[PDB]
Design goal:
This is part of a larger assembly, with 2 copies of chain A, 2 copies of chain B (213 residues), 1 copy of chain C (107 residues), 1 copy of chain E (226 residues) and 3 copies of chain F. With 107 residues, chain A is α+β, with helices and mostly antiparallel strands. Chain A is 12% helix and 21% strand. In chain A, a hairpin with a 7-residue loop joins strand 2 and strand 3. Chain B is mainly β. Helices cover 4% and strands 45% of the residues of chain B. In chain B, the strands form 4 sheets. Chain B has a 6-stranded mixed β-sheet with strand order 2-10-9-4-5-6, with no helix packed on it. Chain B has a 4-stranded antiparallel β-sheet with strand order 1-3-8-7, with no helix packed on it. A 4-stranded antiparallel β-sheet of chain B has the order 11-12-16-15. With 107 residues, chain C is mainly beta. Chain C has a single domain (1-107), classed as Immunoglobulin-like (Sandwich). Helix content of chain C is 0%, strand content 50%. Chain C has no helices and 11 strands. Chain C has strands at 4-7, 10-13, 19-25, 33-38, 45-49, 53-54, 62-67, 70-75, 84-90, 97-98, 102-106. In chain C, the strands form 2 sheets. In chain C, strands 2, 4, 5, 6, 9, 10 and 11 form a 7-stranded mixed β-sheet that branches. In chain C, strands 1-3-8-7 form a 4-stranded antiparallel β-sheet, with no helix packed on it. In chain C, strand 4 and strand 5 (45-49) form a beta hairpin. Chain C is globular. Helix content of chain F is 49%, strand content 13%. Chain F has 4 helices and 5 strands; from the N terminus they run E-E-H-E-H-E-E-H-H. Chain F is rod-shaped, with a radius of gyration of 27 Å. In chain F, 42% of the residues are buried. The chains are: A alpha+beta (107), B mainly beta (213), C mainly beta (107), E mainly beta (226), F alpha+beta (172). Chains in contact: A-D, A-F, A-I, B-I, C-G, D-F, E-F, E-G, F-G, F-H, F-I, H-I. Chains E and G meet through strand 6, strand 12, strand 13 and strand 17 of E and strand 11, strand 12, strand 15 and strand 16 of G. Chains H, I: One of its GO terms (cellular component) is membrane. Chains H, I: Belongs to the influenza viruses hemagglutinin family. Chains H, I: It is found in: Host apical cell membrane; Virion membrane.
Chain lengths: 107, 213, 107, 48, 226, 172, 213, 173, 173
C-alpha cells in the first residue's frame, strides 16, 4: 500500500515579506495597517459640518457662516472649497488662528 | 506579476529643455530599476541602474531618481538625437517586468500637404482597389483622416501608419489606405480624404472622380 | 469621583464608651480629609479638619487620625449629645465627596 | 451618526498600526509610514 | 434560536460514573466549540472542559484532569461528558455552554481557537454525589401564637429540591420559602412562612402543601393556632 | 522552510484538503482516500493564534501630547517636528522587522509541523515500510482501510505485519 | 491555575446610581474577559466579552473596562431587576477560570419582626426537637442570631439561612433552627432567640417556656 | 520545540537526572541504569550563557539629563520634556518585551535541538543493530552488557562486532 | 547550527571545494572524486542575497533637522536638543546591534539547514542500498562506477537496479 503525507494549498494565495525573501506566497494573511476612516468623528459626539463656511469666518460672520456664529461642537469639520471671507482679505497669523478655533469647543 | 506604467505615452520637449519622465510601479521596488534608450532600428542601451546610478560612459545629462513606487527620469540638456523610446524595468518577483515606453519628441506647427492616389489599373485587374491618402511633413503628430465615398463616411476599411519624426525637419508624415473590392470601387464616383490638423484652420479635402483626369 | 467608604453604617454604644468610625477612600488622599457631625435639625458641623485638627467648640473627647487610605474618627467617652450622623469628606480633588454616613445611637 | 479619533474621522483600532494620520486621540493604532503590512496567518502556498 | 438542552444527571454514589448529554440545537452548525461549566448551589461558577472540531480537546480542568472525559457526536448533534470516579465535591449544576471566539482567531473553521467566551448558556442539569439514600420529608407546623406569622418546617429529606405552596397556591402574599440547609446527618431542612392578619386566625384555614418529587412524597399540613 | 518538507521533498500542497492543514492520502486494495490530521493542524493553528494574541487588540492609550502640525517659528518647532519624525521612523522600523521575523518563523513552524508528522509516521511503521522520498511511504503489506486508519490514529501494531513486510522487502 | 478574585463579595447600591465592580486577576490577562449576569434560578447571561465589547442586544448601561490585572464593571442606570450575581472569566492557560461572584443589592433600614416556634409534638415523638427563630422582612442583610437555653449560649447546634432580597419590598428574612435531642429538649425550660440588627436600638429576645402557653 | 523531541516524541523529562540536562537510560541483562551526556549538556549551557553575557552586567552610563518630574504647570516646554521621556520609555519597554519573547522562543528551540542531535547521533552509531521505537528509545537487537552500553555513550561502539547477531534477531519470523 | 550538520556530524569543511558551497566526495573502483551541488549552493546564496537586499542600498533621505553641536552654553532648550539626539542614536545603535546578531544566527542556521537537507535527500535516494556512517558519509553496498555516482548526484539513481546486490552485501555474516 502507499501512504502519503501532505498539506493543503489554495488557488488564491497572498504575497508576504520575510527576513530572507521580499515576495513569498502564503495561504492566508491579514493586514496590520489601518488605512481608512469612515469620515465621521463618532455617533455619541456633537459634531458640526461647516460646509461652505470657512472656519475663521465663524468669528466675523460672512453670509456663509450665518448658521455657525455661536456653534457648540465636540467635533468640527472643515471642508475644501470653503471661504473664510466675503470681501477679499486675509487674516494675519491665519493658520495659528484656526488651530485655536478647532480646539475651542465652539464659540 | 508586477506591472510597470510609464507616463505619458509620448511627450514633446524643445531641444535644450529638461524632459522629466515617469515610471509608476505597483508594489514596492527600490533596489533594482534600470532605464534604457532604445533608438529606432537599434537595440536598447542601458542608461541608469538601481535608481540613480548611471551606466558607464553615458552623458551626465541623464538623471535618475525615485523610491518604492514613483520613479522619474530627467534629461537635462536635450539633443536632437534623443528621439528614442525609454523604458524602465524592476526587481524582482523572480520575474522582471518592463515598462510600456515613453516616446520623446524634439518645431513650428506645420500643416500637412495632402495628396490622394487612385488605385492603379494594374491593381484593379487583380480584383482589389487601394485608395491612398498621404499627409506629408506635418507637426505636431496628431492628425485625423476621414474617408468618404460618394459623401458616405467609410468605417472599418482603412488602415494608416505614421513615420517616425523626420530627422531632417522634425516633421511627421502619415499614409492612409482605403481598401475596396474592384466591384465596389467601380460602383462609386467620388473618393475623398478629409484631413484635420492643428496647422489647418479648416479641415482639408482632397478628392478625385473615378474615371476622370 | 473619589468614593468614600465609611464603616460601620450604624453603631450603638453606651455612655462613657469609646467609639471608632473608619473611612477608606477609593484612592490615596494624603491628609485631605474632613469629618462632619450632623445632629437632628441642626446645621452640619465640621468637627475635624485635615484629618486631625479639632474645630472650635468641639470637645477634646473627639479625635481624628490616619492618612492616605484609612482614617479614623474616635469619640473617647460617648455622651448623649453625641447622638448624630457622622460623615467623612475628601477635599483632595473636585468634586468634594462624602462618606455615606455613620449613625451613632446611644445605649 | 450611526475609541480612536483622527482629524480624518474615527478609525477602527483592531489593527496595531495605521496610516491615516499622525494626529490621534484615544486607544489608537500606532502611526507608521507603510501603506500596508501583511502578516502571514497560514503556511507557504505551494500549488500545482 | 441557539438553545441547547442538558439531559441526564441525578444522584450517584461516590466513585461511580455518569455521563451528561447536551442536545446542541439551533444556529450552531457544530463546527464551533462547546464547553461544560459546573456550579454547586452555594458556590460560584467553574469552567470544567471544552471540545473542538473532532479530537482537538483534550481540554480539562485540573480538578477533573484524570476523571472527566468529553465526547462529541456531530452526527446526532449532541455533546457528552463522562464523569468517572466522582467524588463528593463533584455535586454541582453542570451547565453546557456555547463557545465563541473573535473572528481574527479560529483560522481553520473546525479546530480550536485558544480564546473562547461563552455566549449562550443552557438550562443545566443538577448532579448530586453522596452516599445518601432518597428520603421524603417530615412536615411540622410553625404555629402562630395585627399581623401574625405561621409556617411549616420541612425536615429530614434528601435530595433537593422540595416545593412548598400555601392553600394549594391560593395564598401568595407574604410567603417566604427559605433556602434549605444541610444537616450533619446529610439530610436537608427548610422552612416556609407566611404573615397574615391576626384576625384571620379562627376563620381562615392555612395549609402548607409540600412536594418532594424525588421520593414522590406529598404532604398537606394544616397549621393551627395552639 | 528550514526543515525541507513544505516546498521541499513534498512537491506541492493539496487544494482538495479543506478539513485540515496536514493529512494523509493512501492507496490500497480498497481504493484511494484522503484524511486530515487534526493534532498537527491544531498545533500549527495554536502557535499562529499565539502570535495574533500578542499583536491584535492590545493598543495603548495616549491622551494629551505635543502639536504635530503648524506658522514658521524656528527652533522649538524644529525640535517638536524632529521628535515626532524620530518616533515614527523607530516605530516604522519595529513594525517592518516584526512582520518579517514573524513571517519567517510562521513559515518555519508550519514546515516543522509537517516534518514532525512525517517523522512520527515513519517511526510507527518500523520495518514495515520505506520512505519513497516524496513524503510517501511504500507499505510492504496488505493494508485495508482499517489498517490505514490505525496508522492515522496511532494504534497500528507493526508486529502484526512484520513477517509479511520483511518477506516482501527483502527478496529478489 | 490562574485565580480570579472579585471585590467586594456583595455591594448595596441605590437604584439609579452607578455600581462599579472589581475583577482582580493574578497574572496578565487582556485578550479574553467575559462578564455575566446570573439571576437567581436562571442560567448565566453574557454581558461583555474581551474586556469592553458588550454582547449582542444588551443594554448600554453595562460598561466594561480593565487591562492585564485590574478589571472593572460599571452598571450605569441601575434597575430593580439587576439583583443578579456577576462573574468574570479569563484566558487562558488552556484552562479558563471563573470569578468568585459579586452580589448586587437594590431601601430604608427595617428592623426584623422576630418569631420563635417550639418543636411540634409530632417532631418530639420522632426523637428530635427543632426550635425555629424567624427574622422577618429586615434591611440591611446583616443580622445576628444567638440561641440561649436556660440562659446558656448554644454553640454548634444551629443552622441558618437567608432569603434572596425580596422583589416586593427589598427586604431579607432569615430562619435559624436550633436542633436538640428530645431528651435534651425536655431537660430545659427557657428557649430564647436573641437578635441583633442595625434597625434595633437594642438586641431583641423572643423566648418561650417549654410546657407553657 | 520545532524539532519535536522535547515535549514531543520524548514523552517527559527525568526528575531523577540531576547531573546533566540530557542523558541515557538503559535496560540490559545486568540491570537498569542512567547516565548524563556531558557534551550535549555543555553545548546547551554554553549557548544560554552566551545570551546571558549579552544581557547581564553591560549597562550604560548616563549623567546629566532632563528633568522628569515637575512641581508647577508650565505648558509647552514641559509638554515636550514629558513627551520625550514617555516616548523613550515606551520604545525601551517594547525592546525589552520583544527581546525576552524572542530569546525564550530560541532557548526552547535550541535545547530541543540539542536533544534531537544526541538522538540522531546515537541512531547513526547503532547502524543496523537497533530500531527506533518512536519514543526516544532504541531496541538494541543484541546482548549489550554495561561496557557495551558504556561504549555507545562514549562513542567507541563498534557496530560490526554485533552486526551478525543483530541482523539475525531483526530479520526472522 | 541547530541542525547539527555543519560543525556537527560533518567534522570539517573542504578548502579544496571552490566551485560550490556544498558537494559530494566519493570513492569507488575508478578512483576518488569531488563535485559541487549547485541547487543547494544557490538556495543558500539566494537567501543570503535576500537579506542583503533588505539592508544594502536602501537609505532614507533627511534634510533640515536640528542642530547637534553648540558653541555656547544655553541650558534648558540645548539640554533637550542634545537629549533627543542622544536618545535617537542609542535606539538606532541598539537596532543595528540586534539586527546583525539575529541575522548572523539565522545565516549560520540556514546554511546548516541546507547541508542537512542535501544529506537527507541523498539518504532517501539510496533507500536500502546504503548505510549512514555517521560522519556525513554513506557506505554504498554495491559496485558504483563514475556514472552511477553521477546518477546519484543528479537525481537519476534507480535504487531498484542495485537493490538485490546491495541487500546481499548488507545482510550476511
Amino acid at each position: 500500500a502507499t501512504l502519503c503525507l501532505g498539506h493543503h494549498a489554495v488557488p488564491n494565495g497572498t504575497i508576504v515579506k520575510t527576513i530572507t525573501n521580499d515576495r513569498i506566497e502564503v495561504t492566508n494573511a491579514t493586514e496590520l495597517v489601518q488605512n481608512s476612516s469612515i469620515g465621521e468623528i463618532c455617533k455619541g459626539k456633537k459634531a458640526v459640518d461647516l460646509g461652505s463656511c470657512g472656519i475663521l469666518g465663524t468669528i466675523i460672520g460672512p453670509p456663509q457662516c450665518d448658521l455657525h456664529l455661536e456653534f457648540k461642537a465636540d467635533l468640527i469639520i472643515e471642508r475644501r472649497n470653503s471661504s473664510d471671507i466675503c470681501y477679499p482679505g486675509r487674516f494675519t497669523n491665519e493658520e495659528a488662528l484656526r488651530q485655536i478655533i478647532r480646539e475651542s469647543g465652539g464659540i | 506579476e508586477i506591472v510597470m506604467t510609464q507616463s505619458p505615452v509620448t511627450l514633446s520637449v524643445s531641444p535644450g529643455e529638461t524632459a522629466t519622465l515617469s515610471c509608476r510601479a505597483s508594489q514596492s521596488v527600490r533596489s533594482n530599476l534600470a532605464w534604457y534608450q532604445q533608438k529606432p532600428g537599434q537595440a536598447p542601451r542601458l542608461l541608469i541602474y538601481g535608481a540613480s546610478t548611471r551606466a558607464t560612459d553615458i552623458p551626465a545629462r541623464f538623471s535618475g531618481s525615485g523610491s518604492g513606487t514613483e520613479f522619474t527620469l530627467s534629461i537635462s540638456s536635450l539633443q536632437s538625437d534623443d528621439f528614442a523610446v525609454y523604458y524602465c524595468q524592476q526587481y524582482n518577483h523572480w520575474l522582471r517586468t518592463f515598462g510600456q515606453g515613453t516616446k520623446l519628441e524634439i518645431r513650428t506647427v506645420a500643416a500637412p500637404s495632402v495628396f490622394i492616389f487612385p488605385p492603379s489599373d494594374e491593381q484593379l485587374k487583380s480584383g482589389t482597389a487601394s485608395v491612398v491618402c498621404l499627409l506629408n511633413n506635418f507637426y505636431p503628430r496628431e492628425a485625423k483622416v476621414q474617408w468618404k465615398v460618394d459623401n458616405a463616411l467609410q468605417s472599418g476599411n482603412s488602415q494608416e501608419s505614421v513615420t517616425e519624426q523626420d530627422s531632417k525637419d522634425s516633421t511627421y508624415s502619415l499614409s492612409s489606405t482605403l481598401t475596396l473590392s474592384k466591384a465596389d470601387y467601380e460602383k462609386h464616383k467620388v473618393y475623398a480624404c478629409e484631413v484635420t490638423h492643428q496647422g489647418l484652420s479648416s479641415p482639408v479635402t482632397k478628392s478625385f472622380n473615378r474615371g476622370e483626369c | 469621583d473619589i468614593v468614600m467608604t465609611q464603616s460601620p453604617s450604624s453603631l450603638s454604644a453606651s455612655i462613657g464608651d469609646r467609639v471608632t468610625i473608619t473611612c477608606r477612600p477609593s484612592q490615596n488622599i494624603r491628609s485631605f480629609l474632613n469629618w462632619f457631625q450632623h445632629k437632628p435639625g441642626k446645621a452640619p458641623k465640621l468637627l475635624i479638619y485635615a484629618a486631625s485638627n479639632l474645630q472650635s467648640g468641639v470637645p477634646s473627647r473627639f479625635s481624628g487620625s490616619g492618612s492616605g487610605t484609612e482614617f479614623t474618627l474616635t469619640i473617647r467617652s460617648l455622651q448623649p449629645e453625641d447622638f448624630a450622623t457622622y460623615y467623612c469628606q475628601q477635599s483632595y480633588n473636585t468634586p468634594p465627596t462624602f462618606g455615606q454616613g455613620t449613625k451613632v445611637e446611644i445605649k | 451618526e450611526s475609541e480612536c479619533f483622527t482629524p480624518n474621522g474615527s478609525i477602527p483600532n483592531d489593527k496595531p498600526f495605521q496610516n491615516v494620520n499622525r494626529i490621534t486621540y484615544g486607544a489608537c493604532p500606532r502611526y507608521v509610514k507603510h501603506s500596508t503590512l501583511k502578516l502571514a496567518t497560514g503556511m507557504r502556498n505551494v500549488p500545482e | 434560536e441557539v438553545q441547547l438542552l442538558e439531559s441526564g444527571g441525578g444522584l450517584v454514589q461516590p466513585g461511580e460514573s455518569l455521563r451528561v448529554s447536551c442536545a446542541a440545537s439551533g444556529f450552531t452548525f457544530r463546527d464551533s466549540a462547546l464547553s461544560w461549566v459546573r456550579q454547586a448551589p452555594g458556590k460560584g461558577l467553574e469552567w470544567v472542559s471544552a471540545i473542538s472540531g473532532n479530537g482537538g480537546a483534550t481540554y480539562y480542568a485540573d480538578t477533573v484532569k484524570g476523571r472527566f472525559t468529553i465526547s462529541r457526536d456531530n452526527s446526532q448533534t449532541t455533546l457528552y461528558l463522562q464523569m468517572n470516579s466522582l467524588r463528593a465535591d463533584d455535586t454541582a449544576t453542570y451547565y453546557c455552554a456555547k463557545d465563541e471566539s473573535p473572528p481574527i482567531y479560529n483560522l481553520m473553521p473546525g479546530y480550536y481557537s485558544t480564546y473562547y467566551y461563552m455566549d449562550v448558556w443552557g438550562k443545566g442539569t443538577t448532579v448530586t454525589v453522596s452516599s445518601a439514600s432518597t428520603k421524603g420529608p417530615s412536615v411540622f407546623p410553625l404555629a402562630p401564637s395585627g399581623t401574625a406569622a405561621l409556617g411549616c418546617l420541612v425536615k429530614d429529606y434528601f435530595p433537593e429540591p422540595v416545593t412548598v405552596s400555601w392553600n394549594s397556591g391560593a395564598l401568595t402574599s407574604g410567603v417566604h420559602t427559605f433556602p434549605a440547609v444541610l444537616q450533619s446527618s446529610g439530610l436537608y431542612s427548610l422552612s416556609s412562612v407566611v404573615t397574615v392578619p391576626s384576625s384571620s386566625l379562627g376563620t381562615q384555614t392555612y395549609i402548607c402543601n409540600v412536594n418532594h418529587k424525588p421520593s414522590n412524597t406529598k404532604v398537606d399540613k394544616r397549621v393551627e393556632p395552639k | 522552510g528550514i526543515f525541507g518538507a513544505i516546498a521541499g521533498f513534498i512537491e506541492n500542497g493539496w487544494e482538495g484538503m479543506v478539513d485540515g492543514w496536514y493529512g494523509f492520502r493512501h492507496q490500497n486494495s480498497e481504493g484511494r482516500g484522503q484524511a486530515a490530521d487534526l493534532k498537527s493542524t491544531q498545533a500549527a493553528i495554536d502557535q499562529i493564534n499565539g502570535k495574533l494574541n500578542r499583536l491584535i487588540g492590545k493598543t495603548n492609550e495616549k491622551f494629551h501630547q505635543i502639536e504635530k502640525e503648524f506658522e514658521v517659528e524656528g527652533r522649538i518647532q524644529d525640535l517638536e517636528k524632529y521628535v515626532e519624525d524620530t518616533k515614527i521612523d523607530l516605530w516604522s522600523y519595529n513594525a517592518e522587522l516584526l512582520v518579517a521575523l514573524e513571517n519567517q518563523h510562521t513559515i518555519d513552524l508550519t514546515d516543522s509541523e509537517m516534518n514532525k508528522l512525517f517523522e512520527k509516521t515513519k517511526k510507527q511503521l518500523r520495518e514495515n515500510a520505506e520512505d519513497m522520498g516524496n513524503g510517501c511511504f511504500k507499505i510492504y503489506h496488505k493494508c485495508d482501510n482499517a489498517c490505514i486508519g490505525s496508522i492515522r490514529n496511532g494504534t497500528y501494531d507493526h508486529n502484526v505485519y512484520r513477517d509479511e513486510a520483511l518477506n516482501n522487502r527483502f527478496q529478489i
